[PDB]
């Protein structure tokens, strides 16, 4: 079951049993890390970094080839953002829906969806407060949320 | 139970404590409204002064004239249509006499053919109506 939806969808990735690196992949772990450094220096979310790596370079799992995962490597070098990417996209979606309501106040369905997005933002906000990657004095304020894209 | 957690004791106890008040016997026993409405006031017997004798018509199919007494209590002053149990025992009860009044066994409820009578008469002027019916004792005159 979904969180804020009655759907019961079963569609996600099925990682294989074998954690070993394949024979054809001659790309070393340092070369994979330098490609991750180049993509993060160009400016790209780690999800899209992993997508571009499994499309173009033919490396499916960074965790299987290298030692660490992608946002962990960005944290180890210093390319990670201030707040995580799922919270970032939820804040961006909330700003978009709030601008939509400001243009059209009558949209009660988008108002309900805005309340749902706010609830998911506050759930991830208290979760990252408990995990201590965000400061405890951080607070989602919709008047100041728009400047963060 | 519905909530089967390991530490739901206050939830189960508060839910049962709320739902006991919807029982008929529990609420009648634990509120003072029924005890205030009871003319005995949590008593099994009560003495009272006869003031008049009433012929009460009966209910549906059974059709008769029951014999009751307008008893005014001493401990409260309330008025009770007390019932004269046995045959021919209304003549033993005279006006302005102290009679003992008890229940009828349905715990404050009208019983059978008689509408609106909950209580009955046991003794008449410190002489029991059972002995007056059997013929053992005599009315003191």
């Amino acid at each position: 079951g979904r969180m804020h939806a009655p759907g019961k969808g079963l569609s996600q990735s099925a990682l294989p049993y074998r954690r070993s690196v394949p024979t054809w992949l001659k790309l070393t772990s340092d070369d994979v890390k330098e490609q991750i450094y180049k993509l993060a220096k160009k400016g790209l979310t780690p999800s899209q970094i992993g997508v571009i790596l499994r499309d173009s370079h033919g490396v499916a799992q960074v965790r299987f080839v290298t030692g660490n995962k992608i946002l962990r490597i960005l944290k180890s070098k210093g390319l990670a953002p201030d707040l995580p990417e799922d919270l970032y996209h939820l804040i961006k979606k909330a700003v978009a829906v709030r601008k939509h309501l400001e243009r059209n106040r009558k949209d009660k369905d988008a108002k309900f969806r805005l309340i749902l997005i706010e609830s998911r933002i506050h759930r991830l906000a208290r979760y990252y407060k408990t995990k201590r990657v965000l400061p405890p004095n951080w607070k989602y304020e919709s008047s100041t949320a728009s400047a963060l894209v | 139970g519905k909530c089967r957690g390991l530490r739901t004791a206050r939830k189960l106890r508060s839910h049962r404590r709320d739902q006991k008040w919807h029982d008929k016997q529990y609420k009648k026993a634990h509120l003072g409204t029924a005890l205030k409405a009871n003319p005995f006031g949590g008593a099994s017997h009560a003495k009272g002064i006869v003031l008049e004798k009433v012929g009460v018509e009966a209910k549906q199919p059974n059709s008769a004239i029951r014999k009751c007494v307008r008893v005014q209590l001493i401990k409260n002053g309330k008025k009770i249509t007390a019932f004269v149990p046995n045959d021919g025992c209304l003549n033993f009860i005279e006006e302005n006499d102290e009679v003992l009044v008890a229940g009828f066994g349905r715990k404050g409820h009208a019983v059978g053919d008689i509408p609106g009578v909950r209580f009955k008469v046991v003794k008449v002027a410190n002489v029991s109506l059972l002995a007056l019916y059997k013929g053992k004792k005599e009315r003191p005159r």
Binding site: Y17, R19 | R4, G5, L6
Partner: protein, 129 residues
């Protein structure tokens, strides 16, 4: 969501015993489930099982006989002393001749008879007979 994995697996094998399957696939593999299956094995209600170990929550395939009448579960994990275990086996087992109530102890997961042998109470797992 999935709260009690052990209760889900035992209700699955109970439905499999009621329908009459020779073997059933229960989907998660927990240590409590594996020790429960070995406790049923040492008394002989079920056959010899196996687990399928991926690097995830593994699976379990249990060969089933027809000796298992009902496999039950007691949720949550109530504490059971040696004084109260007689009342537990009175009101949960069908007889004092057969039937077993397994409960986890300090020595390990073991049934009520071995709990009486080793003199150790503990939290209840379920029942099987």
């Amino acid at each position: 969501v999935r709260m009690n994995v052990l209760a889900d697996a035992l209700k699955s094998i109970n439905n499999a015993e009621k329908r009459g399957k020779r073997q059933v696939l229960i989907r998660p593999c927990s240590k409590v489930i594996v020790r429960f299956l070995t406790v049923m094995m040492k008394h002989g209600y079920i056959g010899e099982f196996e687990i399928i170990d991926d690097h995830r929550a593994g699976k379990i395939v249990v060969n089933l006989t027809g000796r298992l009448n009902k496999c039950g579960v007691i949720s949550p994990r109530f504490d059971v002393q040696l004084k109260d275990l007689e009342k537990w086996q009175n009101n949960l087992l069908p007889s004092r001749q057969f039937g077993f109530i397994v409960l986890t102890t300090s020595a390990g997961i073991m049934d009520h008879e071995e709990a009486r042998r080793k003199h150790t109470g503990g939290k209840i797992l379920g029942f099987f007979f």
